[PDB]
Structures are given as C-alpha cells and as structure tokens.
C-alpha cells in the first residue's frame, strides 16, 4: 500500500527522475509511448552515422530493478487526460484502447513537440530533428538521393537541385546537423560517390545575424568562418516563409522586399517547440491556468491551481512562477538585520532567502549592476517587485531537465513524509556550459570561465565531456567503439 | 572500348563475382535493387539481436575501387527484361523509370524469392526470413507483443495466445530462428518481462520426422532433444494448410484426417524458394527453355539456348545441365586405356574427363557402389547414360554460389581472350560442411570426416568458422564486438 507516483515521459526529466527515485519508499510507474530514453544531444551524430543508436538510447526496463531489490514499473501508454480532482489519468495504448490509472503523485515530464510556425508546406515536406526516428529518416533520405543521382537517367542540372541539403535553424542542432553532413560529404561520400560529389551543396538558414547566437560573439564568428571554409552556404539574416515540394522561399531579415526561391533535395527543420496536446488540454481544466500557453509550476515545481499539491511538472513542458518577493515585503524587511534597507543588506541574506525565492539567486539577479542605497519600505517593495519581474524560468534544456529531476526525486526521497517536510528548498539550476561540434574536427564550447574555439584538442575535450554525461556503461562502451569503428572503417552506408 | 560485364544481383553470387573479377581487364557494372550484400547465414542472429546489421552486411560501393587503380560501377536498378539477341537489358529504378543498358557479357545472379506454396493467408499474415529487413521486422514484432502484453487491459488467456511464436520449417533457418528466440526468451526477456515470461511459448512445425533433415540422424535427434529440454514444442510430422489472422491450421503427415487449430501471435515462415519474375519472363523468350521452371546452364555455367554464349547464370536462380556422357560414347571409349570397357577403366581416366563432364566426379558418381565388369559398347552407352541421369546440380547454398562466382570470375580473368580460352574446365563444387546453432550454447556441425554435437567448445568452433567466412575486416570487427556487447550488456530491446 505504498504511495503511488506516476511519471509521465521517458525523456530527460522522466528517465532521470526514475533513475533516482527510491523504489523502496514509493510505488513508481513510468508511462510513455516511448519505451526508451533518447540521449538528444547526440542526435546530429546519428544523421551522418558518426555514432549509432546504441550510444543514443537507453531501454527503460533495464533500469526498473534497483540494487536493493525493489522495483519500478513501466507502461507503454500515451496520457490523454489528467483529472486532478479525482487523482487519476486517462491513457491510450497503441491501438487506441483506453486505460485508466490512479495516482498519489503525478510527475508531468512530457516535453514538447515540433513547431512549424504554420508555415505552409513545412509539415508536408520538411524533416524534423527531434528523436531517433527523425535522425534516421534524415540519414536514409540523404543516402537515397545519392543513389538516385548516380543513375544515368538524370541531368547535371537536376542533380544540383536534388543534392542541395538545406538546414533551417542556426542554433546548436541546425549547426551540428550541418557540420556532420559536411564531414560525411567531404569524407565517405566524396570517396564512394566521386562522380556526383561536385554537385552536392549545403545551406544553413537563420533569421538572425549569428550562427550559435546563444554562444559568444567570437564563437559565432568562428563558426561562420569554419562553415565558409567548408563551402557551406551560410544564409544568416533569412527565414523560411513557404515550402513546396521541390523549392522553398526565404525572406531577408534586413529588407522585407527581398525574397529568394531555392531548389532543394532534403529540407531539415532543426528548430521550434510547441506544447503537447496533453498539456494544451490539461491547461483548460485548471481555472487559474485556463488561458495559459504553458504549464506554470511554483518554485518547488508544483503545478499551480491544484488544491492537493500532488501534481509536479519538470523539463520543457513547464515554466516556473516563483512565490513573489513583493507579496512578502514586510517579512523580508524583518529578516534583514543590517537595518538600513539597502540592496547590500538584501544580498547579505541571499543564502537564506534563496531557499524560498530563487529569483534572489546571484545567478538570477545581478546585485552589482542593481545596487540601491537606503530605501523606504515602499521603495523596497518596488525593488523586490523588479527582482520578481526579472526572474527567468530555467531554459528548456537537457541540463535543466536533469537537474530538476534529481532535485525533485531527492525531495521525494528525503523530505516528503519525513521531519524535513517543511524544509524543502526552492529549485535553483546551475549552468554548466554548452558544447557544439562545428565541422572539420572543430569543437566550440561556451563554459563558465572558459571559451573553446576549435583546435587539435577540442574534439578530445568533447569526447571527455560526453562520455561522462552518458547514463550507462553500455552507452559508454558503444561511444568508444563507434569512434574506433568510424576511424578505421568509416561511416556506414547501409539503409 | 573494354568489354562490358553486367552482373545482376548483389548477393552471394553477384558480390563474390565482383570481389574477384579483374577491373583492369573488364568494364564491370553490378546492377541490383539492393545496394548492399547480405551475409544470409547470420540472419537468425539478427532476429534475436545476438548480432547486429553491421556484421551481416557489406556496402557494394566499398568494393568498387581495387588496389590497382581500376574501378567497377554499381547502379541501383531492378532488371525486368533480358534481350539476348540484341545484347541489352531493360531495368527500372525505384520510381519505375525505365533504363536500357547494353552488355558484352551478362552474369545472372538474381537468386530466388519466398514461396508461400499458395497456402491461404501466409503472404498476408506470416513473416518471411530472407533478408535484413525481414529479420528486423520479426524482431520488432516480437518486441511489440511483449510490451502489449504488459498492459493491464489483457487477460492471461489472451496473453498465452499472443505470446505464442510459431516457426514453420524444420531446416537450418527455422531451427536457428527458434533457438535464438528460445535463448532471448530464457535470458533477457525473462529478466525484463518476468510477469509474462510464463505465458510465452514457441513451436516449430516441420512436415518430416526430423529437425535438420539434411544433417545426420544423430544430429537430428540431438536437436529435437535439445528443443524438448528447452520446452520448445516440436511439431515434426505436421505441415501448415491454412493461415488466419489469429490462428493457423496444421495437418498430420502420418494421418490425413488429423488436423489441429493453433492460436499464435507471431508466425515465421522459414522455408520456401520460388523463381524471380525476371527469370520467369526470361525463360519464355528462350525457345529451347520456354517451358522450364528454372534457368538451365551448361557445365561451364553458360545459359543454354543463347547462340552467342555470352549469358551466364550462377547461384540459386539456375540449375546445371551438363554435356551428356552418352552423346559422346565413342569418344570416351577411344580415350579409355586398354580394350576392356570396365567401370574401373572409366574411373582411371576420371581426372581428365571430369574437366569436361562434372557428373564423372567421385563427388557426383559412386564408382564403388556401381562397379561394372567388361561391357559391350551399347552397355557402356547405357552405363554412361546412368551417370548422366544421376547428376545433381549444385544445391542452392551460399557455399555453392560463392564457389561458382570464384570459378567464373577466374574464367573471365585467366581463360577468356587468352591462349587458354579452349582449356576452360567444367564447374565442380566442393562440399565444406554445414553448421547450425540449436540453442543453449549448443552448436552442431555436419562436416567431411567429423560430426559436432554440442558441448562446451561447440560455440567456440562456430565463432572460429564464421569469423573466417566474413568478407571484410569491418564485419569481423563487429562480429567480435557484438559478442563482447551481448556478454556484458545483453541483447538490446530498442525498436
Ligand atoms: C537535437 C537536439 C539536441 C539537443 N541538445 C541539447 C544539448 O546539447 N544540451 C541540452 O541541455 N539540451 C539539449 N537538447 C534539449 C533537450 O533534449 C530537451 O531540453 C529535453 O529533451 C527536455 O527534457 P523533457 O523530459 O522535458 O522532454 P523529452 O526529453 O523530450 O521527453 C519527453 C517524453 O515524454 C514522452 N511523452 C510525450 N507525450 C506524452 C504523453 N502524452 N504521455 C506520456 N508521455 C509522453 C515522450 O515520448 C518523451 O519520452 C537537445 C534537443 C534536441 C532535439
Ligand atoms: C536465412 C538464410 C540462411 C542461410 N544460411 C545458409 C548457410 O548457412 N549456408 C549456405 O551455404 N547457404 C545459406 N543460405 C542460402 C544462401 O543465402 C543462398 O543460397 C544464396 O543467397 C544464393 O546466392 P544468390 O547470389 O544466388 O542469391 P542472393 O544471395 O539472394 O542474391 C540475389 C541478389 O539478386 C538481387 N535481385 C533480385 N532480383 C533482381 C533483379 N530483378 N535485378 C537485379 N537484381 C536482382 C537481390 O537483391 C540480391 O541482391 C541461407 C539463406 C537464408 C535465407
Ligand atoms: C548498421 C547501421 C544502420 C542501419 C541498421 C539497420 C538497418 C535496417 C534495414 C532496414 C530496412 C532495409 O531495407 C531496405 F533495403 F529497403 F532498405 C535494410 C536495412 C539500416 C541501417 N543505421 C545507422 C544509423 C546511424 C549510425 C549508424 F552507425 C548506423 C549503422 O551502423
Ligand atoms: C575527428 C572527428 C570527426 C570527423 C569525422 C569525419 C571527418 C571527415 C572529413 C572532414 C573534412 C575533410 O576535409 C579536410 F580534411 F580536407 F579538411 C576531410 C574529411 C572529419 C572529422 N567528427 C566528430 C563529430 C562529433 C564529435 C567529434 F569528436 C568528432 C571528431 O573528433
Ligand atoms: C540499436 C539496434 C537496433 C535498432 C536500431 C535502430 C532503430 C531505429 C528506430 C527506428 C524507429 C523508431 O521509432 C519507433 F519507436 F516508433 F519504433 C525507433 C528507433 C531501432 C532498433 N536493432 C538491432 C537489431 C538486431 C540486433 C541489434 F544489435 C540491434 C541494435 O543494436
Ligand atoms: C553463448 C552463445 C549464445 C547464448 C546466448 C544467450 C543465452 C541465454 C540463455 C539461454 C538459456 C538459459 O537457460 C538455461 F540456462 F537453462 F539454458 C539461460 C540463458 C545462451 C546462449 N548464443 C549463440 C548464438 C549463435 C552463435 C553462438 F556462438 C552463440 C553463443 O556462443
Ligand atoms: C547532463 O546534461 C546533458 C547536457 O549535455 C550538455 C553538454 O554540456 C556539457 C557541459 O557540462 C559539463 C561540465 C563538466 C563536466 C565534467 C566535470 C564531468 C567533465 C570535464 C572534466 C571534461 C569538465 C561534464 C559536463
Ligand atoms: C552505473 O552508473 C553509470 C552512470 O554513471 C554516472 C556518473 O558517471 C560519471 C563518471 O563517468 C566516467 C566515464 C568514463 C570514465 C573513463 C574510465 C573513461 C575515464 C575518463 C572519462 C576520465 C577518460 C570515467 C568516469
Ligand atoms: O559488467 C558490466 C560491464 O560494464 C562495466 C564497465 O564497462 C565499461 C565500458 C567501457 C569502458 C571504456 C570507456 C574504457 C571503453 C572500453 C572498455 C571498451 C575500452 C570501460 C568500462
Ligand atoms: C564460403 O561461405 C559460404 C557460407 O558458408 C557458411 C557455412 O559454413 C559451414 C562451414 O564450412 C566451413 C568453411 C570454412 C572452414 C574453415 C577452414 C575456414 C574453418 C576452420 C579452420 C575452423 C576449420 C570451416 C568450415
Ligand atoms: C581483406 O580481406 C578480407 C577477406 O578475407 C578473406 C580470407 O580470410 C581468411 C582468413 O580470415 C581470418 C579471420 C580472422 C583471423 C584472426 C586473426 C581473428 C585469427 C583466428 C581466425 C585464427 C581466430 C585470421 C584470419
Ligand atoms: O582494413 C582497414 C584496417 O582495419 C582492419 C583491422 O583488422 C582487424 C583485425 C582483427 C580484428 C579482431 C576482431 C580480431 C580484433 C579486435 C579484437 C580488435 C576487435 C578486427 C579487425
Ligand atoms: Mg521526460
Ligand atoms: Mg529524451
Ligand atoms: Mg521535448
Ligand atoms: Mg517536460
Ligand atoms: Mg547475387
Ligand atoms: Mg545475399
Ligand atoms: Mg535468393
Ligand atoms: Mg542466383
């Protein structure tokens, strides 16, 4: 008669929650239509065949039996509805049979889905890069085109059109997918398809001026330079406005009147999140959240507007709306001991108060750039209000989904139904840095305190980092073997 | 201006011909809708996940550039018609575009296709085991059923029906597929799906009394016994007469009035060859062969009824009809040493005459069991006629397709258009033995001079043999890694 936790989703949030939740203390069931976890950062490597599926996945059932002897459960179902008042969910199986399941706690970790921005033709003609199947269909399509263009029944003009790969999105995924194809094209493809090599082209399309815009400006410049040197067409300051079967249209970001029509053989849509239908439907059943576009949780990751406080959400499907500083001005004033309401006084209690208000974190509020002398209570109120307003929810990353999962599973293991049940601290994420592979052995990294901008050892750095991020020795084994395989025998052409 | 050889098929015949044909001497194009070679003997290992696709395939384009600097070509096309008088073929691409190609020599190696014996429902409901895609669909279906039966919305009786795997055919493929699933079920499946393990069953269905009927009787008995000990249902002396969506019917071979209806979740059809449509159509355009069921070639592998003798066929798509001894009686009599026509006299010239008549081979004619005293010329004629009649074409195996490919490519390299062009010997195959994996570490082997019947080292023997039969170091690399992988981390569930 253990308390029942249902986890929705087998992704970065759901799977890492499963990995850490105590199966002895709780009865845990994970529910997802996907019976494996996907190591998403390595998906671009799958498009070119640099790494294989064994590196990029984990089967959920392999992690249901922990060392202590207590077990979790897994069900291959898609959740369609949540009924928070009666504490059950409705699911369907692959045959649309309905399943009803009761819970004591619900962890919503259903992620997000691809977003076409309703641009005509994108869903019909473009390839997304969101999961294992996506990457493999992309790889297979490219391989198919190479074989098709080796046939005698096609002209050089038609080849140039068919062998043009266009990647839409200048963020890390678009960049890495482009880099991986450029390497593949320049190495194995050049060797095995020498007669059509010269007709192959790649373009990357990005609305802003910078590839990798969330990295540093020096990294962006170096990335565009590396792409130029690789003869990739860098179409920064352009965005897609229409997609047809054999061509698409782009629009200048600098001149609204300038458009271009481009022929293509493979169109890859590397960008865009939208909310799952489950989340859209769930929102409308919570009065307080009825017209939200995204699920809001509080600073403890509890879904807002649930009287029972027994539904949580983590990862890409949620945004945090923390307890407001300015609704607790007087309490905070008393807490301040340096009696003189200054920003420095507040910062002096920031260790204690961040346990309640994550927006006070030095990672969330720049105290040095927002210093304030002595304030009246009303002015202090207004200041707290600015800190509230400034709070940024965790970015939609694997990094944050993983940290939230560990935080929350630890809360269930060591705080809930124990004498620390009222000492639960708020969630505050830690940025660990970002990495990107940008072609021809060059890796860039934007880390706390370091930037990496290519060089002979940058690819070594990437391997050292990722082998430690993999979640099993099996995957690490494959990670190592795949690089040996690729070095000695090259990328595979089997499709 | 080099002479053009077109090879049809990328299989055991076609690919091994490609591996050995001199690209300097000829202009070689291989044509096949499959741009990889399939190492068919390891396909059962793929069904259970014991080995991966990288062990079982070779990409054709990897072998087009030989060390000399001379190259072959490959085109992804399906051949639809041969026009032997005008020395060209018609092909289609994957989009049904027609391609016309001329040749100086044509090597037909298109193999065979699956045969349902027109039994109602097998093409609709059964899974075949002939190529990479077949094996993977079988694996995926089995994995899908396991997940479906873990759902709460299904009774135990429905589970027993759904988790029944039936394999039709008691030859090596059927036996090996059954053994691989039995191992998978008893190991990884038992561990990951403990709650439904007890509902899983496997049956193998075979018309004759023996599993592995082409092996020795001791091997057949040991195999049936090993299957019993693994609680596999061995349905020898039964054959399938009808297949429906959820059940099939079998018929006793020993009592025509006894039938049984059996429920099943996965039905695997491991047996049956039929001729390709291409061969069926080609036959009707050759007057002398117009009503044949299979393509006949002479002792030098030349298709019969082609005035230009420039079409050859090898592998499963052909049968050899050698030059008849009895149509050359007087010539043979003169060749014989002494004046007395005895079977021993014939056997004394058997080395020389076997270069012309493969049916005189000691591997084809038992001289000791057909000893003959002094014969009159007419009696000798009748004796020769018996040898002609006794000749058996090479069995449809990878071993024979490979040997035919090496024989014929060597004929092109070293006999055709050289001063040995009239010293071309007939094709005579060499039996090297057979191997089968029969479950729970047990390997059997029927070899010249040895039989292997399981034991601790039989699996080691299997590995030693197969790693030497693989056609590249890449595949051998994967062969070794896969066994390490499977030992340390188990077979994968990713699908
Ligand atoms: C190509 C690519 C590269 C990336 N690289 C990085 C990187 O380098 N660094 C980084 O920090 N982040 C990276 N990310 C981001 C990271 O993948 C996401 O932020 C992360 O997936 C979020 O985790 P999640 O658990 O919220 O969603 P997901 O990991 O997507 O998991 C969602 C799960 O919910 C399941 N699900 C969906 N609907 C339902 C339903 N109705 N009922 C039950 N289950 C359902 C899905 O099958 C899936 O298992 C990358 C993403 C992509 C696509
Ligand atoms: C599961 C399994 C296990 C086996 N195990 C063994 C074993 O242990 N030992 C053994 O000796 N034999 C074994 N065999 C038999 C062996 O696979 C066959 O005898 C062998 O494949 C015959 O070689 P082939 O070249 O004639 O045909 P295949 O190897 O089948 O090749 C035929 C090729 O022709 C291509 N093709 C088909 N139609 C056309 C067309 N119209 N135009 C152009 N190309 C075309 C096909 O795509 C294929 O590439 C096994 C077979 C199977 C199915
Ligand atoms: C091995 C291999 C494959 C692969 C595996 C299995 C198949 C199965 C398959 C399915 C259908 C087929 O019918 C048809 F002929 F139609 F394609 C053929 C094969 C195809 C490709 N992908 C990879 C993808 C990324 C990186 C990799 F390292 C690999 C890799 O190393
Ligand atoms: C090594 C290396 C490679 C790689 C693979 C193929 C090539 C092929 C290639 C590219 C450019 C070429 O023109 C030339 F070399 F002339 F510049 C020629 C071949 C180059 C690099 N990918 C990686 C991808 C991700 C993470 C990594 F750690 C690596 C990595 O460590
Ligand atoms: C790794 C791996 C796989 C495998 C590879 C790629 C996929 C790709 C895939 C395609 C579609 C998907 O969407 C869906 F989930 F819907 F199926 C998911 C994955 C699936 C399985 N087969 C194997 C088969 C035999 C032996 C093996 F060792 C493997 C193996 O080691
Ligand atoms: C080793 C080995 C195996 C193998 C794989 C899994 C098991 C799992 C297993 C099966 C039955 C079990 O209950 C019992 F032990 F009772 F039999 C327990 C585990 C057993 C053998 N297949 C092979 C397949 C082909 C070629 C080979 F060379 C091997 C081989 O060398
Ligand atoms: C785990 O979340 C998945 C997100 O993957 C993003 C890749 O970014 C990696 C940067 O984060 C780090 C930081 C430090 C490290 C350690 C300390 C483990 C490795 C080291 C020594 C290379 C810095 C690893 C990864
Ligand atoms: C069962 O748990 C597996 C998941 O482990 C999660 C934490 O892993 C962090 C450490 O991971 C590694 C990975 C590789 C290595 C090796 C041995 C390859 C050495 C290295 C990374 C220093 C080069 C060391 C530690
Ligand atoms: O027993 C389970 C076996 O797994 C435990 C250790 O697994 C590994 C896997 C890979 C590795 C590295 C990364 C060093 C690669 C290796 C052993 C293939 C060289 C080390 C240990
Ligand atoms: C030639 O490839 C055709 C496919 O054959 C697959 C079945 O193999 C059956 C075994 O026949 C052989 C072939 C070679 C060998 C060698 C000589 C390579 C192995 C050895 C040294 C262990 C006896 C043994 C048995
Ligand atoms: C480029 O060559 C690839 C094709 O090779 C065909 C001929 O191969 C026959 C010998 O093959 C092997 C395979 C493995 C080995 C090793 C080194 C693994 C030793 C072994 C088989 C004795 C265990 C030796 C010879
Ligand atoms: O060809 C290009 C160079 O790569 C060929 C490497 O050849 C081998 C030799 C041995 C092996 C085995 C399987 C014996 C070696 C092992 C143990 C490293 C996997 C694999 C590949
Ligand atoms: Mg998740
Ligand atoms: Mg995931
Ligand atoms: Mg998501
Ligand atoms: Mg989520
Ligand atoms: Mg062939
Ligand atoms: Mg083959
Ligand atoms: Mg065949
Ligand atoms: Mg053939």
Coordinates of C-alpha atoms in Angstrom, one line a residue, chain B residues 169-171 175 204-221 223-224 234 236-237:
Chain B
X169 CA 10.1 -25.2 -41.3
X170 CA 12.5 -27.7 -39.7
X171 CA 15.5 -26.9 -41.9
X175 CA 15.8 -24.3 -36.4
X204 CA 8.4 -25.3 -34.6
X205 CA 6.5 -27.0 -37.4
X206 CA 8.0 -29.5 -39.8
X207 CA 6.5 -31.9 -42.3
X208 CA 9.0 -34.7 -41.9
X209 CA 10.0 -36.6 -38.8
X210 CA 13.4 -34.8 -38.4
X211 CA 14.6 -31.4 -37.5
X212 CA 17.7 -30.6 -39.6
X213 CA 16.8 -33.5 -42.0
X214 CA 19.9 -32.8 -44.3
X215 CA 22.2 -33.3 -41.3
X216 CA 22.9 -36.7 -39.8
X217 CA 20.3 -38.7 -37.8
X218 CA 22.3 -38.3 -34.6
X219 CA 22.3 -34.5 -35.1
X220 CA 18.5 -34.5 -35.8
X221 CA 17.8 -36.5 -32.6
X223 CA 18.4 -31.2 -31.9
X224 CA 14.9 -32.4 -31.1
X234 CA 8.5 -29.7 -31.7
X236 CA 7.5 -32.7 -36.5
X237 CA 5.3 -34.6 -38.9

